[PDB]
Design a protein around this ligand. Structure first.
Ligand SMILES: O=C(O)c1cccnc1
Ligand SMILES: [Cl-]
Lengths: 327, 5
């Protein structure tokens, strides 16, 4: 067994209606308030468009929910409604349905984001601190509301670098945390999957998102995106073990009594834990500080229970320059 | 497409 160290009982202390998303009855707006303008590049199955809100002349984003089973539509809508107003959480404006096909669509605020592949190569030390701090605010918020995002990755963190705005998007994999519940491990992008997912440990919690955030921090400070670049899910764990070492991996499995897929016996090998300083080189030196490495070391831990919480991370000295300027 | 086309 395992339990979240914080926010464990949030859903137990709310009404059944809060987390019982299968019972949620979405409230459909007028699809005719919105006029599609262009399809956005969001992924192989996505149908996401920029659109005009004809009622206020506002630019919006429309996400047509097609590939999904109905229970997951309710889950995403209910989660976005529960997080409405939250800090750095993408704002849901409306939920509409085609009258004829019945295909639902979610309408979101438009963020003028800079593609992460171009943005990450121009970030400075202070920019990374700032945007990581802003992302932590979103994660602390959703975790405090009893929700795990489960798909934190660069593509899901929209940054408008001119207005210094950040939004955590794509809540389609997010779920409510309940103590002792077993969750589907087929979540997250391969490169951002926590070790718990890779070894099929289902009793995970909000700390999954803190692994993913650590992966993003490492990628930014070391100019190595993604940080752990595996070729499949098995190799992904190897890539992690080549950095974190195998002894702590086997220690984690032993502690939680984790059933290890036997094909890992052949590929994991024996690896020492590498010191984080060893990933500094001439083209990332201006981004790396002892405070950054101290934080990263407390996020990228096998043992999900020993990772910092979002709030603990926000209190780390790495973020002092940001907190001071927010005063 | 919502509002025509
Ligand atoms: O999937 C989402 O939440 C999304 C996608 C693009 C833009 N805004 C939100
Ligand atoms: Cl790698």
């Amino acid at each position: 067994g395992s339990r979240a160290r914080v926010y464990a009982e949030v859903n137990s202390l709310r009404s059944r209606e809060y987390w019982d998303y299968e019972a949620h009855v979405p409230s459909w707006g007028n699809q005719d308030d919105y006029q599609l303008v262009r399809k956005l590049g969001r992924g192989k199955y996505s149908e996401v468009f920029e659109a005009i809100n004809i009622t206020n002349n506002e630019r919006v984003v429309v996400k047509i929910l097609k590939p999904v089973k109905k229970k997951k539509i309710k889950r995403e809508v209910k989660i976005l409604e529960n997080l409405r107003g939250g800090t750095n959480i993408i704002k849901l404006i409306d939920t509409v349905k085609d009258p004829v096909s019945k295909t639902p669509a979610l309408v979101f605020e438009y963020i003028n984001n800079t593609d992460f592949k171009q943005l990450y190569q121009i970030l400075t030390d202070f920019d990374i601190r700032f945007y990581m701090y802003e992302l932590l605010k979103a994660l602390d918020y959703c975790h405090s509301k009893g929700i795990m995002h489960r798909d934190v990755k660069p593509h899901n963190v929209m940054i408008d670098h001119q207005q210094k705005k950040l939004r955590l998007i794509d809540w389609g994999l997010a779920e409510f945390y309940h103590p002792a519940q077993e969750y589907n491990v087929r979540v997250a992008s391969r490169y951002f999957k926590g070790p718990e997912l890779l070894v099929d440990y289902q009793m995970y919690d909000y700390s999954l998102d803190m692994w993913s955030l650590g992966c993003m921090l490492a990628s930014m400070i070391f100019r190595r995106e993604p940080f752990f670049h595996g070729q499949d899910n098995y190799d992904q764990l190897v890539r992690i073990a080549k950095v974190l070492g195998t002894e702590e991996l086997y220690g984690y499995l032993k502690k939680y009594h984790i059933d290890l897929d036997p094909h890992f016996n052949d590929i994991l090998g024996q690896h020492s834990r590498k010191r984080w300083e060893n990933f500094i080189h001439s083209e990332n030196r201006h981004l790396v500080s002892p405070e950054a490495l101290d934080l990263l070391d407390k996020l990228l831990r096998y043992d999900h229970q020993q990772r910092l919480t979002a709030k603990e991370a926000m209190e780390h000295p790495y973020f002092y320059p940001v907190v001071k300027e927010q005063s | 497409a919502x509002m025509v086309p």
